[model samples]
Target: AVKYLSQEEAQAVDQELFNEYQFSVDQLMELAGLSCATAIAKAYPPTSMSKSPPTVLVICGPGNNGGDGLVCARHLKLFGYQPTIYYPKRPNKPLFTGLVTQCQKMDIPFLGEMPPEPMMVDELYELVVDAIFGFSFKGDVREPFHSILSVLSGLTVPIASIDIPSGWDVEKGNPSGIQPDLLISLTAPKKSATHFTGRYHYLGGRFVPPALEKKYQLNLPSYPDTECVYRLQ
Candidate 1:
């Protein structure tokens, strides 16, 4: 049984690491994205049902979680999976801009809306990455995300959420939102993930320092071997 963090606790842990440990947001995002990519590979391999490589639609948000998704797209591209990003709200931060630019340089597409029917055939997407929110997400669904969620609500695409499933209440859980088939829990599993009946649940986001883990009482599981992440039940 792995320890879980409430949204508030997870937010505080990030503050402690960024302010006290000096691990830049970019550094954290890189680690997080890499781990998620690793998990995606582990769960759904790049080997495709079609002759073309599998495509991933990574839906991003307006916050750091979205930043992590942008980074994940790049890493997934390097791993030989074609990744397309659907970022409805992009922050005006340089970190995000730079990350997006890095992905674009690799020829990844940034979509404004859901791809059309022709683009979304079974041969294309291996899965969707729901980086639309994380432990920081709260309250009722707002613009773009609300409309976006409405759009994604009944889609047949299998989703792999970054941290928390989009539109979910982190602590209490939301049965109404999108439920991912695969979840990569950054740092520790958020309280909501505890109820996940997903096919694959993984613990990612390595690099939380030892002292800080003890300080925050984060009882994380040990990653086996030299891998960046480990599977969770």
Candidate 2:
């Protein structure tokens, strides 16, 4: 069986990757987002969808997971998919700003706010990427995000969550929020993921050093060939 990480254990492994293993946030974010896009492409290829240059909506929050969303959008555009980004709360940090710039350069459209009506989203997008809250997120959802998540809960279009699904507790999971059709867990699967009934579950972020993996006893599934993600189900 594959090992699943508790919230603190997940945090520790992330810190070790940055501190002990010398991995930069951007480096890992790039790998993570690339894997997300790659997995999405494999699961929902553009040719399979009715829309040409299949339209995807990537909703991002204010953290590293959101950064991953930005990178995913850029790559999706490169892969001949039409990816639009909705980033309501953006950090002023250089890394995030640079990611936004890159996506903008690729001519990906950015929405000022989430569409209030789920029907509007259904009409506009073939798929929605949930890159909002990550494992570190705690407490009740706040401000604009509360409304955003509420809207997501009603979406008819399938959601593809990055890391843990937004609004779900890292260990406990959510009872009634958005249930994604696809989940691409970064590094390793979080404890909440054991509850996932999603159609597609993939393990991404292939940058874990072997020493760290052994130290954490992370019995991760092997990636096939040079692929960045390994399907778990």
Candidate 3:
């Protein structure tokens, strides 16, 4: 059986895929983000999830995981959903700038300190995307993310985490981290994924090459028929 990867192990494999296979970082992130969006669509179809198109809030961070969120938002827009991004800390890279601009070009708004209404996040947005972290989190939450996590804890709206839940430890898990209702695990799931007691657990991100797959010996379940993401427990 294939074993679950630790945070450090996952990072090592990610680098090998890039360094050895010549896989571009942007290329993989795009696929990862698209898988996440596809997971959301399959889980909650437009009419079934909301009246028409659901109003979603995609929260991004300063890393590639955040870039995945940006890519996810763009796909959500193309899928006819109302997606707004709340990006507090963005990197100065051109890739980040171009992702933000792509959303803007489609008129997707980057939320400031507030959404359309204050103290009404649940009323305004039906679903939330937790793209703040992936397999890259350490010790505990810090900085603006700490404050953001606090607010997320108090919300009534459901959260769909990308990869790993932002603040949780990859191996040990966090007691006080935000427990997302839906989790989309990118690549192979981290150790924390097996411990998720959420309603839905979907596996996304298929950038791992065969050599790496045999090297890591990942034993992931098959995605649903004709689907980019697989539902994992």
Top TM-score model = 2
RMSD after Cα superposition, model 2? 0.7
For all candidates in order, the CA lDDT equals 0.83, 0.93, 0.84
Q: Write the per-residue lDDT of candidate 1 for residues 1-233, one digit (tens) a residue.
A: 66788777887888988898998888888999999999998988877434357788888989988988998999898988889988877788788888878988889998767664523533456678888877877678888677777656666767888888888888877787787799899888888887788899999988979898888777778888789989985
Model 2 TM-score (2 dp): 0.98
Top candidate by lDDT:
2
Between prediction 2 and prediction 3, which has the larger TM-score?
Answer: 2
lDDT of 3 at 182: 90
TM-score of 1: 0.93
> Which pairs of residues have clashing backbones in candidate 3?
none
TM-score per model over all chains: 0.93, 0.98, 0.94
Clashing pairs in 1: none
Ten residues in sequence with the least summed lDDT for candidate 2: 105-114
Error of 3 at 14 (Å): 0.4
Candidate 3 lDDT, tens digit per residue, 124-200? 88888999877877665777888888778888878899988888888877788888989887778788877788899
